[PDB]
Amino acid sequence: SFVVKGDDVRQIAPGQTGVIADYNYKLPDDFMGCVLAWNTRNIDATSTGNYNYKYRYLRHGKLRPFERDISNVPFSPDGKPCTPPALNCYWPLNDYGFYTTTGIGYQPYRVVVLSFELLNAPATVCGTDLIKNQCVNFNFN
Amino acid sequence: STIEEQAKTFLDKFNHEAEDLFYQSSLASWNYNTNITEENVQNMNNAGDKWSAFLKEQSTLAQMYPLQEIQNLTVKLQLQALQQNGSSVLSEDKSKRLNTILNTMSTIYSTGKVCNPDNPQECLLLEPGLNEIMANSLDYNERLWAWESWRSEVGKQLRPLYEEYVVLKNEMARANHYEDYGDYWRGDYEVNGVDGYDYSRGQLIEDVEHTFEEIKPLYEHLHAYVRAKLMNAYPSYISPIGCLPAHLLGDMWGRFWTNLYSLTVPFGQKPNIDVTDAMVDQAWDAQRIFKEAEKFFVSVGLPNMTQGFWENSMLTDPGNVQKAVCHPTAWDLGKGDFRILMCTKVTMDDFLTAHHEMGHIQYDMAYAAQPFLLRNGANEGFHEAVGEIMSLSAATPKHLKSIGLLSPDFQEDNETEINFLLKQALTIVGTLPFTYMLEKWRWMVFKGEIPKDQWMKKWWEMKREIVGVVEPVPHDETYCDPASLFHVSNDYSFIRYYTRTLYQFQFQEALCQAAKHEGPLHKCDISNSTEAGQKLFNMLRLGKSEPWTLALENVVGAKNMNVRPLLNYFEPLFTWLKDQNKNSFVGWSTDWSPYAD
Known part of the structure; x- marks a missing residue:
């Protein structure tokens, strides 16, 4: 579960390099179930401002499938640790900026990936009545 | 690692940070524009100062980046627009003094008012009250009194602030290594180092003069005709070989001339081109106007308006x-x-203005994918010209036949054709000598071709020489009638409307090139063919990533501005202009005045 920019929703799909899917949420090749999304111009977008919603766009290299990128260390173009607000040591996490008065592609979408794995256990998460005196087949539980 | 990767990094940080801050600034501007209350203007100056200080404080990180290391143009024009300081680079005293005098002029021009000579209670501002009476009154003394009182009450207050404006503003131009503030207007089209797509600054003066010499005979015949009709509607006032009094030109300064049409209708016994009453007859509101305009945008191939446009505006x-x-x-x-x-x-004018501003917003939605300070035109003129494209194509009878107004058997005699041509020609032609003269005059004042105590003299004498316009009463050096106009008092150049009027008929010929147009340039509607919309779209979204020369080549196949499209637009009308005024004099005499006789 994650709330994104609409431009990031096509960046949550197999293939689909993007910018956000480079550093935040890497998309696999085959290990991919469903992608469901809907719009939260009422919840995750407030017309006056709510900036609990930030994203990271600077990290030394891309990711691996379903990697969870949490840790907040500021980014430098040649390492060698910074002392912010020194120059070329940027904040990685900047605000979304999606309000209720925005358009269509810039209202933040609730996107959930249903990641499907095939039979590394018996099947867990998935999806008539009887007739008398008639020769039938069965199947009970 | 390299300089250009961290330049891209700072610029994309600047995009994702400047997005939100400019959005807050223009939200505060929008809350002021939909609600004038002092709480809204205290909203309007917090985030706007937090944008102007943002460009400057991040220019202090942008000017540390050496600009002449990048071979590319795409991020180089990005770094140029940040390393321009804006207007914040002078001494600490003179910067705030010039910006304060600009705010003072922005107050006193916009809120000043005039009062009746026998009654110091009958007091009203510029718009409305004056400019509508300056458009429709048949009284000489009323239009003259409004004309002179507006220049005497606030223009005399705007002259010493213009005296300090020229010195501190040319001092800003010197502190940013420009020639004058005229060179600041010539450095808006300043593309550099593309070698085939470049443009120099004095070449703007070159182009303006060399393509206004093709305006001068057409404007000369048109000025003769409107002098004939002004001697008709205002008898015994105007010399037959003279210029025009400045309070008869439809507006205050002589800029827009369409309000002469009720007194310069050529053939009045023929059905009207003004469809305002037809818009009255079906009881229209603003909503059907904007939606039918948007349907015209769909028919020319441009997409619908999104949810924010109808939920917020x-x-x-x-x-x-x-x-x-x-x-x-x-x-x-x-x-x-x-x-x-x-x-x-x-109103038909509000109908075309709905087309105009929605053409601007469609242009904005086209370049909405650009980087954020390149979320703007390639230059200042393509915005206004693309906006005027939809209104000029929509104003043809080929579109009025298609709206649902004007029941669909509309004739094609040359009569209403020539009436439409002359009515559009009043505005389109008569704005250009005032544009030429106003811009060249401020170029002379900032450059120094005029001494600082000959401004009002050379102003009205070049209105006589170029625009053929006389003031009816003499002005001393206490006045400043240019500074008592909007764009001189509120920081906008005026040659963008000249470039508008040239690229307007350029884009008219180009968008009629693809839709298989048959007649001459006047009857051409760009509607119902979307290949013209595609050809306009492959300049509509570029922004300042590519120059105006490259996109202008991709539109018309030329690289220098040309007004021969306007001349071939007006040429049957020009033959009509040569035809009618044979019992008149074609020209104007600059020694005539209503105060010189």
């Missing part, structure tokens, strides 16, 4: 407690929030 005039200004302006906010501030009446 104001489209009528409130009147009540939430009162606000109603000038139709297009707003880039980013975040998919592109708006029009427009209080619309049921």
Whole structure:
């Protein structure tokens, strides 16, 4: 579960390099179930401002499938640790900026990936009545 | 690692940080434009100062980056627009003094008012009250009194602030290594180092003069005809070989001339081109105007308006407690929030103005994928010209036949054709000598071709020489009639309307090139063919990533501005102009005046 920019929703799909899917949420090749999304111009977008919603766009290299990128260390173009607000040591996490008065592609979408794995256990998460005196087949539980 | 990767990094940090801050600044601007209250103007200056200080404080990180290391143009034009300081680079005293005098002029021109000589109670501002009486009154003394009182009450207050304006503003031009503030207007089209797509600054003076020499005979015949009709509607006032009195030109300064049409209708016994009464007959509101305009945008191939446009913009005039200004302006906010501030009446002019501002917003939605300070035109002129494209194509009878007004058997005698040509030609032609003269005059004042005590003299004498316009009463050096215009008092150059009027008929020929147009340039509607929309779209979204020369080549196949499209637009009308005024004099004499006789 994650709330994104609409431009990031096509960046949550197999293939689909993007910018956000480079550093935040890497998309696999085959290990991919469903992608469901809907719009939260009422919840995750407030017309006056709510900036609990930030994203990271600077990290030394891309990711691996379903990697969870949490840790907040500021980014430098040649390492060698910074002392912010020194120059070329940027904040990685900047605000979304999606309000209720925005358009269509810039209202933040609730996107959930249903990641499907095939039979590394018996099947867990998935999806008539009887007739008398008639020769039938069965199947009970 | 390299300089250009961290330049891209700082610029994309600047995009994702400047998006939100400019959005807050233009939200505060929008809350002022939909609600004038002092809480809204205290909203309007917090985030706007937090944008102007943002460009400067991040220019202090942008000017540390050496600009002449990047071979590319795409991020180099990005770094140019940040390393321009804006207007914040002078001494600490003179910077705030010039910006304070600009705010003082912006107050006193916009809120000043005039009062009746026998009655110091009958007092009203510029718009409305004056400019509508300056458009329709048959009284000489009323229009003359309004004309002179507006220049005497606030223009005399705007002259010493213009005296300090020229010195401190040319001092800003010197502190940013420009020639004059005229060179600041010549450095808006300043593309550099492309070698085949470049443009120099004095070449703007070159182009303006060399393509205004093709305006001068057409304007000479048109000035003769409107002098004939002004001697008709205002008898015994105007010399037959002379210029025009400055309070008869439809507006205050002689800029727009369409309000002469009720007194310069050529053939009045023929059916009217003004469809205002037809818009009255079906009881229209602003909503059907904007939606039918949007359907015209769909028919030319440009997409619908999104949800924010109809959920957020104001489209009528409130009147009540939430009162606000109603000038139709297009707003880039980013975040998919592109708006029009427009209080619309049921008018053909408001219909074409709906087309105009929605053409601007469609242009904005086209370049909405650009980087954020390149979320703007390639230059200043393509915005206004692309906006005028939809209104000029929509004003043809080929589109009025298609609206649902003007029941679909509309004749094609040359009569209403020539009437439409002359009515459009009043505005389109008569704005250009005032543009030429106003811009060249301010170029002379800032350059120094005029001494600082000969401004008002050379102003009205070049209105006589170029625009053929006389003031009816003499002005001393206490006045400043240019500074008592909007764009001189509120920081806008005026040659963008000249470039508008040239690229307008350039884009007219180019968008009629693809839709298989048959007649001459006047009857051409760009509607119902979307290949013209595609050809306009492959300049509509480029922004300042590519110059105006490259996109202008991709549109018309030329690289220098040309007005021969306007001349072939007006040439049958030009033969009509040569035809009618054979019992008149074609020209104007600059020694005539209503105060010189």
